[PDB]
Design a protein around this ligand. Structure first.
Ligand code: MG
Ligand code: MG
Ligand code: MG
Ligand code: MG
Ligand code: MG
Ligand code: MG
Lengths: 199, 190, 175, 138
RNA sequence: GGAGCCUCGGUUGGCCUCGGAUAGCCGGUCCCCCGCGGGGUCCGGUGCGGAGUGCCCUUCGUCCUGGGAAACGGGGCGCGGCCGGAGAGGCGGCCGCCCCCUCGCCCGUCACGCACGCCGUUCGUGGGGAACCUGGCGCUAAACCAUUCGUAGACGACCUGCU
RNA sequence: CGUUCAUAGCGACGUCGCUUUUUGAUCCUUCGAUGUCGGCUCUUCCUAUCAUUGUGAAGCAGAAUUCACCAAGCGUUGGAU
RNA sequence: ACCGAACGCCGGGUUAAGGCGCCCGAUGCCGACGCUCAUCAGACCCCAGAAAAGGUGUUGGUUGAUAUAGACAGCAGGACGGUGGCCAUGGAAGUCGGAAUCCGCUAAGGAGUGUGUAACAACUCACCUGCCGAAUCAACUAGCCCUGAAAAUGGAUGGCGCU
RNA sequence: CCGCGGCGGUGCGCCGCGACCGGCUCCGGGACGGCUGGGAAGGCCCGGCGGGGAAGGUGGCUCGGCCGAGUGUUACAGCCCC
């Protein structure tokens, strides 16, 4: 009942729009590995674009003025907020369905997580164009915890490699088990390729 | 417009053995290995012939700026082949009207102390790029030798010690001093 | 004029007879247009430019569509233009490769739009001529003149991005 | 690092459009993005067709670049492409997928019942294998 | 274990490689190197992906008896030990012992209010919160005022002291 | 013009612009009233950069220098009338 | 005040002008063909913003050369004599300027592009080869892009964003 | 009082069905006319007549195991095309 999306490889605005409509229709969404989100146009372009946004501040009392979140997760959360009616009750309710994370923490690390292929960089940009990793961008604009998030993801990736290896070994046993047993499953396996699987 | 196909060939010499992990050419031979990743150039690096005699670089449906890369990849590969076989030797001669630029290497090649440039108390230490090894030559009085396999790293490390020794707030047409690259050659010629 | 995909129309018309000129001469034209209504208009436009002849003073004798006589052959049309810039008016010779004349003129109009921001109403097609392998000046067209033609469809980007709007699998573009 | 090419005489599978799910030999290349195409034996008339909609197989039957339909028909039947295609894994998983769509509710139930058992027989084999392999490790 | 206000949304699950994209996935190594695995080379398979999210898992009436194929699997909110897991762990795993059952796939064999054509059915649910009856083992206060202080102070606040 | 040399630095005859720190035009707003010059005090913003940082230019030997670029971080005073 | 359309109170349909990533009803079309990357991109009548002039940035056109009688750039070899030619002496024998402005040798060199000289000198700038190995090169023109392009609270293709 | 016989108005409250008409918006079939009495195509083949790319060919060179593959030239038809 909960979309978990891997923010990696996705386009900042293009993912946001897809998340926004889903969140409005009551779907609970989790976006994960937000630092991996990457935005079209070269890096310097987008740094300057952020640094302009930082300049925008309420002159008389900046403490009120636009809160420039540095964290990539919070950046993504901000751009998603831009595509909601976030002054309403329904808009706020919708925003509260959304959940966004720098890196991929423990509830979601052991969950298969989807990819929006309509917002995916490989698909949407030409291969000769330039783009910016929203990690670097966040890092250079203030974000403190790039290095920490990086190290935790190494540990996560190592722990995931093991899990995969064990999954592979089981799949291998399954394939061998079928070969061991293929005369006493023969007239089940036959019907599962009359109605069109296994082929 | 889109050019239906363009390509080139690079005939590797029988001394060298090049291999390519996808788009990441690794060239090895007499002096050592040199890898280089062209993931960012977007081309078909074929490697054809028994005895592995030539490297072929296609580029399908390229527009004019895409087709410019075709040659450049080929050229870098040439330099990579050269570096493995012969190597690169950039010679650079020190120049001065007075202050005789006292050079002295340190760790091995690595460090280059450049004392008494223009009478300045500030000693310019200059690192080299890993693999490059500076050395003070004989048979030529004021002259450095930079040797290394990877040309990029050598020529940049030359530039480091060229720009290090620069003259501020003067007429640089008058004050011609510093260590400048005089000859870009090889370690061994054959 | 606007567009859709054009059809070749043969339009013939004459300045209608008087006491003085009892059997006035017929004039024919090759008028490319979306339909016969606008074809007949376009005819009168060209005919007014050339001859003292307006729609009132004349009659269109025969307007009829002309079909491509070799649809399933692939040909090289040389097409001579006359557009209007933001600046002054200009001549061109373009070359297109198509199954049909009409298609080749449609294909021209689109290019003019793209390459020059030239809008239909600005443009005049003078002649459109199917041409040999040779007599082709444009290397865009020439690169397809080859017997053992061969190329891959390299970075074959997916469509159907909203059949699975979400998915487990990251896609593939090698084939 | 390409293996499949828009060659004259390459058979291609038309992914979608009016003539979806049909094989088609490329007669001649018109343009950057448009081929002149035929499928005499596959019920596809000679026409231009955009590359977008056709994905291309591993079958290059040999005829000259602008032959007159008769000859490409002969090259199709000589190679026996219809038989070869069907024997391919690709065509089989197309056939598979079609069958799954056609599946009636009684059929569906039958399968459910069949799988229920078929996976249970595999599961016990797998568990036993694991415990024995555990025995090898010990 | 029993009632009893209130707040509602829901109406099988999916327990995970990394990533690449002018490439990838799986095997197996005969052979070599590293710490049952990791890396390599070589070979054999897939690749409009069937070791496919176009996917996978799970079944959805209850019972009886009396055959076949499949058969030691499941349970008792069964019970004790040994693990792994810290990013916001919050979940699993593996090992002993007690009792009970014969559950998936085909067949026969009957019966279950068959409520007489007709709507919010069907679950997560022993849900969240608030007020109420039973057992077992645990507990035994701080805070504020007042007073005091002056590192503090407009007043509050703050720092201190007082069997 | 600049010994020489159109363009280091300039630039006639012509021409194209921007600006609202000038002054005019204008009269839209306010005449049941928006307190009318300066100075003092205090903050902030701009850059069309005087100085300072890093640089390209010279008719830059040095010193002094104008010309230009990134640039508004920090400065930019005491008095006589 | 523009564009569409002119209002009794309602149901169904259908439109206009405008739209259809998300805010926001509608492209979640396997839409078609091009063009364009901007360290100030661009993004819809009225309308809320820029010019002259530039740019081998890229893309089209137009017109012309020159070429296997061996180009075009790139590596190199000569650049003379009739001759202090004449006007100008203040010095211009090619060279501050200007009227001239042809012949010889010719393979071929202008009575000279400049550097520079008081003036020379010296240097430099055709015609031809040697190597290499197919297109090369010029002048216009018009699309998108860029330069031109400087304001004072922090800020507005409506916003988010978008390649 | 039992007939819910015949007619007339009604339903306590929530419902559903049916066929008939009006107005819509879609779907699927089939049958025709015209045209350059459509254009192309297909199928059968036969007799000729030329021209072009460019070939079961030949040839220089290259790459693989006389054969297969890749360029190059004159070009008839034993690949086609017009
Ligand atoms: Mg801070
Ligand atoms: Mg100085
Ligand atoms: Mg002068
Ligand atoms: Mg006031
Ligand atoms: Mg400035
Ligand atoms: Mg109007």
């Amino acid at each position: 009942q909960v979309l978990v999306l891997d923010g990696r490889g996705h386009l900042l605005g293009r993912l946001a729009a897809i998340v926004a409509k889903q969140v409005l229709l009551g779907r609970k969404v989790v976006v994960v590995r937000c630092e991996g989100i990457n935005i079209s146009g070269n890096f310097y372009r987008n740094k300057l674009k952020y640094l302009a946004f930082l300049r925008k501040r309420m002159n008389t009392n900046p403490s009120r003025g636009p809160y420039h979140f540095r964290a990539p997760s919070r950046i993504f959360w901000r751009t998603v907020r831009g595509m909601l009616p976030h002054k309403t009750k329904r808009g706020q309710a919708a925003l509260d369905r959304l959940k966004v994370f720098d890196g991929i923490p423990p509830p979601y690390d052991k969950k298969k997580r989807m990819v929006v292929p309509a917002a995916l960089k490989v698909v949407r940009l030409k291969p000769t164009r330039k783009f910016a990793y929203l990690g670097r961008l966040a890092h250079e604009v203030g974000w403190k915890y790039q290095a920490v998030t990086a190290t935790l993801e190494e540990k996560r990736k190592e722990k995931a490699k093991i899990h995969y290896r064990k999954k592979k070994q089981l799949m291998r046993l399954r394939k061998q088990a079928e070969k061991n047993v293929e005369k006493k499953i023969d007239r089940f396996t036959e019907v599962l390729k009359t109605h069109g699987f296994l082929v | 417009m889109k050019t239906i196909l363009s390509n080139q060939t690079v005939d590797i010499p029988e001394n060298v053995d090049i291999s390519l992990k996808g788009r990441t050419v690794i060239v090895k031979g007499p002096r050592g290995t040199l890898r280089r990743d062209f993931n960012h150039i977007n081309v078909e690096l074929s490697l054809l012939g028994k005895k592995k005699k030539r490297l072929r670089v296609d580029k399908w449906w390229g527009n004019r700026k895409e087709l410019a890369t075709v040659r450049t990849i080929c050229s870098h590969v040439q330099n990579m082949i050269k570096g493995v076989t012969l190597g690169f030797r950039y010679k650079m001669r020190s120049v001065y009207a007075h202050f005789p630029i006292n050079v002295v290497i340190q760790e091995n090649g690595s460090l280059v102390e450049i004392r008494n440039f223009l009478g300045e108390k500030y000693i310019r230490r200059v690192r080299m790029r890993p693999g490059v090894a500076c050395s003070v030559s004989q048979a030529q009085k004021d002259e450095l030798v930079l040797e290394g396999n990877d040309i990029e790293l050598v020529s940049n490390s030359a530039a480091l010690i060229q720009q290090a020794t620069t003259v501020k707030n003067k007429d640089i047409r008058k004050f011609l001093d510093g260590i400048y690259v005089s000859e870009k050659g090889t370690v061994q010629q054959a | 004029k606007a567009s859709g995909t054009l059809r070749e129309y043969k339009v013939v018309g004459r300045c209608l007879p008087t006491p003085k000129c009892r059997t006035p001469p017929l004039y024919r034209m090759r008028i490319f247009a979306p339909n016969h209504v606008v074809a007949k208009s376009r005819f009168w436009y060209f005919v007014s430019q050339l001859k003292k002849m307006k729609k009132s003073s004349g009659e269109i004798v025969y307007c009829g569509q002309v079909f491509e006589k070799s649809p399933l052959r692939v040909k090289n049309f040389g097409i001579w233009l006359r557009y209007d810039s933001r600046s002054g008016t200009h001549n061109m010779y373009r070359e297109y490769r198509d199954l049909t004349t009409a298609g080749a003129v449609t294909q021209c109009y689109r290019d003019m739009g793209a390459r020059h921001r030239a809008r239909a109403h600005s443009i005049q097609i003078m002649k459109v001529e199917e041409i040999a392998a040779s007599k082709c000046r444009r290397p865009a067209v020439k690169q397809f003149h080859d017997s053992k033609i061969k190329f891959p469809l390299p970075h074959r980007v997916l469509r159907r991005q909203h059949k699975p709007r979400f998915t487990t699998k990251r896609p593939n573009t090698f084939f | 690092v390409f293996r499949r090419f828009v060659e004259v005489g390459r058979v291609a599978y038309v992914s979608f459009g009016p003539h979806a799910g049909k094989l088609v030999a490329i007669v001649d290349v018109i343009d950057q993005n448009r081929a002149l195409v035929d499928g005499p034996c596959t019920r596809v008339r000679r026409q231009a067709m955009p590359f977008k909609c056709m994905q291309l197989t591993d079958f290059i039957l040999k005829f000259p670049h602008s032959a007159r339909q008769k000859y490409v028909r002969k090259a199709w039947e000589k190679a026996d492409i219809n038989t070869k295609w069907a024997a391919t894994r690709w065509a089989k998983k197309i056939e598979a997928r079609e069958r799954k769509a056609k599946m009636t509710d009684f059929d569906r139930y039958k399968v459910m019942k069949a799988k229920k058992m078929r996976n249970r027989i595999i599961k016990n084999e797998v568990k036993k294998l694991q415990r024995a392999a555990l025995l090898k490790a010990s």
